[PDB]
Amino acid sequence: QSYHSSIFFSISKGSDKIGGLLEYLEIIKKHNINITRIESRPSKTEKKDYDFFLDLEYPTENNKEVEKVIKDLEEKGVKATTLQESSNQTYAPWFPRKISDLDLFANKVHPGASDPVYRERRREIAKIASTYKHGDEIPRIDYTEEEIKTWGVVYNRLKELFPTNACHQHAYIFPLLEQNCGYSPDNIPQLQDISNFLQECTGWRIRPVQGLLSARDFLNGLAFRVFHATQYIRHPSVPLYTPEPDCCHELLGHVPLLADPDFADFSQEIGLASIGASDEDIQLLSTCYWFTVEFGLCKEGDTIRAYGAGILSSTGEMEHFLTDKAKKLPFNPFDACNTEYPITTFQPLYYVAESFQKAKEQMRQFADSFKKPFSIRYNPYTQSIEILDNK
Amino acid sequence: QSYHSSIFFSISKGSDKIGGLLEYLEIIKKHNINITRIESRPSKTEKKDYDFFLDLEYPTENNKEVEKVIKDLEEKGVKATTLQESSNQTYAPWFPRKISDLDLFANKVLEMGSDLTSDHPGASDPVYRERRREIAKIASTYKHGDEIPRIDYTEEEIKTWGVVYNRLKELFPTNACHQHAYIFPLLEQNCGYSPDNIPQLQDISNFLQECTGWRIRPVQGLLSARDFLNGLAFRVFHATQYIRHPSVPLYTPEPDCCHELLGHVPLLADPDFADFSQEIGLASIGASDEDIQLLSTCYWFTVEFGLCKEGDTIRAYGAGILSSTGEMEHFLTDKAKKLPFNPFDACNTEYPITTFQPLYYVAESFQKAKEQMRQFADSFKKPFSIRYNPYTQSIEILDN
Numbered sequence A: 001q002s003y004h005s006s007i008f009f010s011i012s013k014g015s016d017k018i019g020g021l022l023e024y025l026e027i028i029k030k031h032n033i034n035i036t037r038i039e040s041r042p043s044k045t046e047k048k049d050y051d052f053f054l055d056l057e058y059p060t061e062n063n064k065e066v067e068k069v070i071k072d073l074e075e076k077g078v079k080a081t082t083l084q085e086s087s088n089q090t091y092a093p094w095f096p097r098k099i100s101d102l103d104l105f106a107n108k109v110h111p112g113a114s115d116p117v118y119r120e121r122r123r124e125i126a127k128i129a130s131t132y133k134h135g136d137e138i139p140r141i142d143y144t145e146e147e148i149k150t151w152g153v154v155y156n157r158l159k160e161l162f163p164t165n166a167c168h169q170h171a172y173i174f175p176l177l178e179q180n181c182g183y184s185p186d187n188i189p190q191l192q193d194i195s196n197f198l199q200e201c202t203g204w205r206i207r208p209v210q211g212l213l214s215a216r217d218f219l220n221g222l223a224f225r226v227f228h229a230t231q232y233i234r235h236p237s238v239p240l241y242t243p244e245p246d247c248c249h250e251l252l253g254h255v256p257l258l259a260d261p262d263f264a265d266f267s268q269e270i271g272l273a274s275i276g277a278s279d280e281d282i283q284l285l286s287t288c289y290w291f292t293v294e295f296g297l298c299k300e301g302d303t304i305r306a307y308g309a310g311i312l313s314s315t316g317e318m319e320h321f322l323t324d325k326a327k328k329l330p331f332n333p334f335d336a337c338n339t340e341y342p343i344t345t346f347q348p349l350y351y352v353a354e355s356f357q358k359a360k361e362q363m364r365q366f367a368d369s370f371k372k373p374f375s376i377r378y379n380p381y382t383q384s385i386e387i388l389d390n391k
Numbered sequence B: 001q002s003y004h005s006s007i008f009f010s011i012s013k014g015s016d017k018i019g020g021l022l023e024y025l026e027i028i029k030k031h032n033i034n035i036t037r038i039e040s041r042p043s044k045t046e047k048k049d050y051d052f053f054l055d056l057e058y059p060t061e062n063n064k065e066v067e068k069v070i071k072d073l074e075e076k077g078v079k080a081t082t083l084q085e086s087s088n089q090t091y092a093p094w095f096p097r098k099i100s101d102l103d104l105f106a107n108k109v110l111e112m113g114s115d116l117t118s119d120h121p122g123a124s125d126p127v128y129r130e131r132r133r134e135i136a137k138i139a140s141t142y143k144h145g146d147e148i149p150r151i152d153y154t155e156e157e158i159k160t161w162g163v164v165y166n167r168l169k170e171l172f173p174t175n176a177c178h179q180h181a182y183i184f185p186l187l188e189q190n191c192g193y194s195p196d197n198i199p200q201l202q203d204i205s206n207f208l209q210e211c212t213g214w215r216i217r218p219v220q221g222l223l224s225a226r227d228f229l230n231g232l233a234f235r236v237f238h239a240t241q242y243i244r245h246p247s248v249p250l251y252t253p254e255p256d257c258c259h260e261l262l263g264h265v266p267l268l269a270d271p272d273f274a275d276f277s278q279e280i281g282l283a284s285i286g287a288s289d290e291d292i293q294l295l296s297t298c299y300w301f302t303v304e305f306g307l308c309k310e311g312d313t314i315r316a317y318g319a320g321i322l323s324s325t326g327e328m329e330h331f332l333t334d335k336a337k338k339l340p341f342n343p344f345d346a347c348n349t350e351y352p353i354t355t356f357q358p359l360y361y362v363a364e365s366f367q368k369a370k371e372q373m374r375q376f377a378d379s380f381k382k383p384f385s386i387r388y389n390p391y392t393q394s395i396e397i398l399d400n
């Protein structure tokens, strides 16, 4: 368990301070093992400045060595803005800056808990997410006959319901998943194939995840158009329901919508908003996420359909949302963000999105007043987060 | 040796032709010896349509087998468009569709690889030839997605680099366009630029990706003009990993690593130049052979030997100038003519490859050059227009 800090500052080409600044940066890079990375880049704002980035990694929270580094740094003539992973508000929240920085989350994480066999199996699959690095191929799972049997039952069951209950984007993409990603009742699709297909449709990627991440970590991954997905399958004893995300939920629920460009933008938008957001704002985003990506409905003419991954992968949920006892409301993040919700029962309340581009715009407007030290932007050419000093 | 063909077509969701079409595709997938890939994707132009892409390779040119595929396919009720690598003009020119399809180029060299000319100073150096073989092999086996292998350069290799580096370094502040001076300290700080060290392509590629989305691929040697320029459409620069022979440090006709790293890389980290360079790439996608040649000439007179104007002064941004002491010391003098860059003018202009330029073109800015190149590209006869998708890193075809 480690605590990350990042220090930002800018300086102009031809500055009198650069010489000593650079020299200082060399000494700490060599003789301070808490420093993991120091880099400089062209400024996104002042076309004549350089942006600098100093990444530190400590074993304990609010390590005061950071202040020591800040002081020695600002002594060379620059003003430093420091972000940190912490419960305190001494510094604004840290965020992963590159898609490869999501590697830092890899080790940050019941019907069959009363089953040792199933428990050892879960342990083995989770090992793979634990060791996976950005850039690697996603290792393929040799699923057992039992596991494949469970997939088949869920698959065939949900397949009977999609055409009448799923939003049209889902019906649109599913045959492409069949034709390109090996979707079938007889075969559990591998994440590496799904990730390649998603990349080529909307730039989204998958990485395996051990289990539940914190809301901040998971949402931050979305900012890079990276979806964290489990590889294990639910226990065979209870096939038609599970309280947790298993591969059926990931692959039949989340993945198809990620191949729709407008949905893909919307999801990333939620991710961007989370980058560097305060804990209270993360919680608002997480709830918005629940009522859209997880349990959202779309409007299609005089009809209401499901796009939420938690609905699409649950026969009981799909056979519930259309009943009159379940309340429906137009999606509005100001209304949804504060709404309580059950995790162990069907939803009593669903929010209806008009269109994904509208949901994207609504979220962006919602997030616009989030307090953050930097303006966060995504650059599709560099595939990275741009950080602007305009606040 | 092989010739690529691409067949594509669309079909609407819910078409009753889909079942039979998929059945037909399964058949040729197993039984057609020349089929290399069949893929279906969401349409990027019609929200209710699917795009299908069939890729094929044939050992001979104008292979009449492709027509049978087109006939069979269109019997299933779709209208196919075919692109083909050929000196014939039956079909429009093939181009790589996805960034990873540049792997198809890995062995398409040509000259300045491990097959050297007899006047090459290292042609009868057996150590050097083995070294060029080794380094070429690395490019040969490199696949999109790999980290670029790091070369353990020898002390004689590092010595040659240092001679060139030190000689060039003195001239940069006075002779290079300001984008160079801006970026170079970052190359020193982030990519290991110094005279004691040859920078590794993987480090440069990471740096360029974060600056402008450009990346590096190691290349054996000279690619055909079409292949090289097509690579640019993806913001992919093919760069060599070998260094020139130690006997003649201040000159080489080949694009060795001193040329790539000291001439080409600094400008690619500038957003406007990087967009300009991609625009040239995009112009080449599906361009006729004749237009590829025109683009090549535009490239020569800009990316390789272009000048910028800064107030009353002329400076160099062309990689062939920045990496050559001789050339740097030539362009500023009145011994060479200077003209305003204009692709409609410059594209017909002749030029020597084995002497300094008698004529250089000045670009007002990389934004104007880009816009000029887009006008140029539009003047081509292309059967469709293309656009680049940075999210999918793919060329998208649009109807004309």
Ligand SMILES: O=S(=O)(O)CCN1CCN(CCS(=O)(=O)O)CC1
Residues within 6 Å of the ligand: A201, A202, A203, A260, A261, A262, A264, A265, B389, B391, B392
């Ligand atoms: O899904 S795909 O990867 O194919 C294209 C995603 N891309 C994201 C950016 N938006 C417009 C930004 S905005 O300025 O309109 O907000 C266009 C669609």
Ligand SMILES: O=S(=O)(O)CCN1CCN(CCS(=O)(=O)O)CC1
Residues within 6 Å of the ligand: A379, A381, A382, B211, B212, B213, B270, B271, B272, B274, B275
């Ligand atoms: O290099 S950077 O990543 O910093 C900015 C590059 N980016 C390339 C795309 N153009 C608009 C596309 S076009 O439709 O105007 O050609 C804006 C600038």
Ligand SMILES: C[C@H](O)[C@H](O)C1=Nc2c(nc(N)[nH]c2=O)NC1
Residues within 6 Å of the ligand: A209, A211, A212, A213, A214, A215, A216, A218, A219, A228, A229, A230, A245, A285, A286, A287, A289, A290
């Ligand atoms: C943030 C989001 O609303 C929700 O709280 C979370 N979802 C997930 C998560 N982690 C994983 N692996 N998968 C999720 O779906 N962390 C939390």
Ligand SMILES: C[C@H](O)[C@H](O)C1=Nc2c(nc(N)[nH]c2=O)NC1
Residues within 6 Å of the ligand: B219, B221, B222, B223, B224, B225, B228, B229, B238, B239, B255, B295, B296, B297, B299, B300
């Ligand atoms: C297109 C450009 O003008 C020139 O013809 C080419 N240059 C290069 C090439 N191939 C490589 N590898 N590097 C170049 O610089 N082939 C074509």
Ligand SMILES: [Fe+3]
Residues within 6 Å of the ligand: A245, A249, A254, A294, A309, A310
């Ligand atoms: Fe989920």
Ligand SMILES: [Fe+3]
Residues within 6 Å of the ligand: B255, B259, B264, B304, B319, B320
């Ligand atoms: Fe060159």
